[PDB]
């Protein structure tokens, strides 16, 4: 007595019409089970009459939760209303879920829901062939929508959030040290290139970042004016006296003058080193802020940079928390993060560090109150030994 079948698909809802009804008494016979697998026989049983795709991803999740609780979304109300004929005698609808049945009946008094094994068997067929039954109707791809909906449905129940997230910390550290290496490497090259044109400056201004900025100014050593002397004197300070030495030594040096095109790169290349240092300063401050937000307790106890390195070593804040006190100590024992009486404080700090991580990881909005008192406790231990 089944006449219509309702199927819920991540793309949308599909309604079918059952042309022929399969044998009830022989339902367990091998033959009636085999026809479910064969597509040639199955098409004779059911046909697609309607398909209403969801408007968007957000709609799919709303119906995914509504279907989970056995509630009838506005979309499902529409498709059934459009299809099911008005009906002494009631149109029969096959649904997978028994919990969904009463909800449909309240909305539509004239439809009877069936979810017995006969209905379950047809649903098994529809799920089995999937897009093949849609006769080319646009269901997108049933697998990609399934994947996207699954993460959406799951995280909604768990209440996953970005505030808890600490992967941002891990990425910044791997980038911060990489910036530090690259700034040094290129800054070294800037010294060599401008070293050829005027080697004595690389001795005068050892600080590379100072050297790069000064090279942007004194492109050609031949240019020497008292006004320029003041301008380069403004760069850094004359306490070292480099302002006077460069003016004097530029007048008198063995530096070999290089081409304008090569000069053009020393300033351009020095500019790139300047930008990276500017970016590295920005990224370091971003890391500092994020630790205070993510792991205020760990960051306050040891420091923003050190704690982030400890988090990266464990691979995640959660991994750090689950570890025992002994394991955390050897976690930073390769870079001496925590460093006989010297060893005792290292071990003592390790236990407190492990305690700090637990508070950060399992609190939705960690505060820094416990981290400070934890640190003062270490300070008293520090004074004692």
């Amino acid at each position: 007595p089944i006449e219509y079948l309702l199927f819920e698909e991540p793309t949308g809802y599909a309604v079918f019409k059952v042309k022929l009804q399969q044998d009830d008494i022989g339902s367990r016979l091998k033959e009636v089970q085999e026809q479910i697998n064969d597509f040639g026989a199955f098409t004779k049983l059911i046909e697609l009459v309607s398909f209403a795709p969801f408007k968007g991803a957000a709609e799919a999740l709303e119906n995914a939760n509504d279907i989970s609780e056995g509630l009838v979304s506005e979309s499902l109300k529409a498709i059934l209303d459009l299809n099911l004929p008005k009906a002494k005698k009631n149109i029969t609808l096959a649904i997978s879920d028994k919990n969904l049945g009463p909800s449909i009946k309240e909305e539509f008094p004239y439809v009877d829901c069936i979810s017995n094994e006969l209905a379950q068997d047809l649903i098994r067929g529809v799920r089995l062939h999937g897009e093949k039954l849609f006769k080319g109707l646009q269901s997108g791809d049933l697998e990609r929508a399934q994947l996207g909906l699954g993460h959406a449905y799951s995280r909604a129940k768990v209440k996953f959030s970005v505030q808890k997230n600490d992967n941002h910390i891990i990425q910044a550290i791997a980038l911060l040290d990489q910036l530090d290496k690259d700034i040094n490497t290129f800054a070294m090259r800037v010294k060599e290139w401008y070293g050829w044109h005027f080697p004595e400056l690389a001795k005068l201004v050892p600080d590379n970042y100072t050297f790069a900025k000064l090279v942007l100014f004194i492109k050609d050593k031949a240019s020497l004016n008292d006004d320029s002397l003041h301008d380069l004197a403004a760069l850094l300070n004359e306490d070292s006296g480099i302002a006077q030495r460069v003016i004097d030594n530029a007048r008198i040096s063995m530096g070999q003058d290089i081409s304008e095109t090569d000069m053009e790169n020393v300033c351009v290349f020095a500019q790139r080193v300047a930008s990276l240092a500017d970016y590295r300063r920005q990224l370091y401050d971003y890391l500092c802020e994020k630790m205070h937000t993510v792991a205020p307790n760990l960051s306050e106890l040891i420091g923003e940079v050190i704690g982030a390195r400890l988090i990266s070593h464990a691979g995640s804040l959660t991994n750090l928390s689950k570890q025992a006190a002994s394991t955390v100590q050897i976690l930073g024992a390769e870079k001496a993060l925590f460093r006989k009486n010297k060893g005792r404080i290292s071990r003592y700090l390790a236990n407190k560090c492990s305690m700090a991580s637990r508070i950060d990881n399992y609190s939705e909005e960690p505060s820094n109150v416990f981290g400070s008192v934890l640190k003062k406790q270490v300070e008293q231990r520090l004074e004692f030994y």
């Binding site: 928390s321 689950k322 570890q323 025992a324 006190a325 236990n351 637990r358 508070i359 399992y362």
Partner: protein
């Protein structure tokens, strides 16, 4: 809802602690969160007892994640000072573990309480 969950009642807590004190006498009790973390890792823990009044609780909330993943029962007792007294040590204890031993003289009592915690969870 509360982070410390589930919390054993007065009737159960006295039964739990009575097992704790005997396990201490038989050298089958591990005391402290760090010890309890090791036992779960080694898979030698019968079940974990925790203190619900730990200040803050968060310093022992890594155990439930370990306890469930290994399918080891766990329970909260209201008092840490009382739990420490049961353990046989002179300081409060926030977490304890009952080591696994099928040859223990107190096997039946451990299994009796272990059933109650499973139902309570």
């Amino acid at each position: 809802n509360p982070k410390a969950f589930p919390l054993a009642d007065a009737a159960l807590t006295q039964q739990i602690l009575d097992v704790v004190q005997q396990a201490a006498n038989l050298r089958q009790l591990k005391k402290g969160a760090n010890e309890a973390t090791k036992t779960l890792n080694r898979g030698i823990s019968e079940f974990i007892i925790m203190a619900a009044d730990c200040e803050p609780i968060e310093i022992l909330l890594h155990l439930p994640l370990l306890c469930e993943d290994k399918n080891v029962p766990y329970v909260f007792v209201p008092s840490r000072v009382a739990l420490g007294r049961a353990c046989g040590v002179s300081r409060p204890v926030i977490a304890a573990s009952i080591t696994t031993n099928d040859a223990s003289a107190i096997k039946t009592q451990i299994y009796a309480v272990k059933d109650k915690i499973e139902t309570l969870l």
